């Protein structure tokens, strides 16, 4: 149930979201990391942005602890937040979230976005009018930064999120690149399905790792309250009757069949282990063409603050 990736590494294809918006107390990703590897993931998806490493890798040592798993078995993702791509940031951030999550090394890390932020201690640096700062950083920098951590045993993997081909491609025609992204971890769901951006990961080896792969958490701060729900698809739906699953079962197949690693959040101790339930049934070649006709090109993160940093990603037609 794994892939293997361009450097030789094994990603598990089901990956456990732990993103909560601030008002979900903090104790809660402790809770629901065990009960995700309880109910079977091996993949858990978090990020220095998310303030909760320290939670998911507490949750990660208690579960090594009782010897339901080793940390051999647990495929760890943090990511590098946009306030640290100079390079001479990138490892101390890192450092940093191996110590709040008391981890040696995270299975994979990752460029969290490539519109660079000025650096400081403010997440969301703001002017005096109110918008967001971008800074200007070369990336190929950030990237062989990135490839240091990875000889360093810091990273045992090192991919990029929120990438488009021409961004991906700066990489991959660096002078001198030592090691490939493994990943790129985008948006990605039947209304929204990249089927261009993923044709080109496949061609280079890199895999594509679907978030908001059931809709998103539709955080009013940052998705449109109008935009379609997902999971209310009336193709969705009635694809799950036809299956026995749900329209969440049927999404997450959808990635896995076309050869997408694909995340799931959920808070929900049910809704947990019936995602972990993707493995258990198959959709046949004609529901995937009709899932593939769904596609909107709907973001549901589409927020104008960041539509003219020099370096959004959709700007591109991928
Ligand atoms: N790299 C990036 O820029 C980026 C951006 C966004 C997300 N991500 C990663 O991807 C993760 C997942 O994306 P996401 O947080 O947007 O959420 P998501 O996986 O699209 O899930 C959206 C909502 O679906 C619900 N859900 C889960 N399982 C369900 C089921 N079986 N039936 C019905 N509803 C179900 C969850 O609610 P309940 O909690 O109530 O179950 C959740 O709030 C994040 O947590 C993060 O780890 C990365
Ligand atoms: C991710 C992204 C990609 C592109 Br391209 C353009 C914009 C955005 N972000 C937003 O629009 C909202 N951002 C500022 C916060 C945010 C809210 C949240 O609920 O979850 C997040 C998760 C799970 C992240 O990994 C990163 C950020 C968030």
Redesign the pocket.
């Known amino acids: 149930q794994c892939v293997k990736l361009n450097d030789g590494h094994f990603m598990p294809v089901l ?6 918006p601030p008002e979900v107390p903090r104790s809660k990703a402790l809770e629901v990391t065990k009960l995700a590897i309880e109910a079977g993931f091996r993949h858990i ?3 220095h942005l ?1 303030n909760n490493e320290e939670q998911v890798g507490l949750a990660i040592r208690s579960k090594i602890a009782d010897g339901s798993v080793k940390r051999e078995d647990i495929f760890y993702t943090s ?1 590098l937040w946009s306030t640290f791509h100079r390079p001479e940031l990138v490892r101390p951030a890192l450092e940093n979230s191996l110590k709040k999550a008391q981890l040696d090394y995270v299975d994979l890390y ?1 460029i ?2 490539p519109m660079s932020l000025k650096p400081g201690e403010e997440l969301s640096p703001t002017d005096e009018n109110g918008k967001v700062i971008f800074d200007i950083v070369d990336l190929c920098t950030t990237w062989e930064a990135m490839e240091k951590c990875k000889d360093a045993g810091l990273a045992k993997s090192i991919g990029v ?2 990438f488009n081909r021409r961004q991906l491609e700066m990489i991959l025609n660096k002078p001198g690149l030592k090691y490939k992204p493994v990943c790129n ?3 990605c ?1 039947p209304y929204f399905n990249r089927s261009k951006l993923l044709d080109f990961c496949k061609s280079k080896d890199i895999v594509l790792v679907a ?8 955080d009013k701060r940052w998705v449109d309250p109008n935009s379609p729900v ?2 209310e698809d009336p193709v969705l739906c009635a694809l799950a009757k036809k299956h026995k699953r ?4 049927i999404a997450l197949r959808y990635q896995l069949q076309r050869g997408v690693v694909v ?6 101790e049910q ?2 282990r ?2 972990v339930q993707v493995f258990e049934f198959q959709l046949t070649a004609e529901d995937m063409k009709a899932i593939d006709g769904l596609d909107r090109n709907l973001h ?2 589409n927020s104008d603050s960041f539509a003219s940093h020099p370096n959004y990603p959709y700007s591109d037609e991928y």
């Open positions: 990956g456990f979201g732990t993103y909560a998806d978090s990020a998310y990511k990752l969290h976005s999120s929120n971890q985008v948006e769901h978030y908001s792969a059931l809709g998103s958490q539709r997902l999971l749900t329209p969440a079962l995340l799931a959040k959920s808070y929900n809704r947990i019936q995602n549901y993160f």
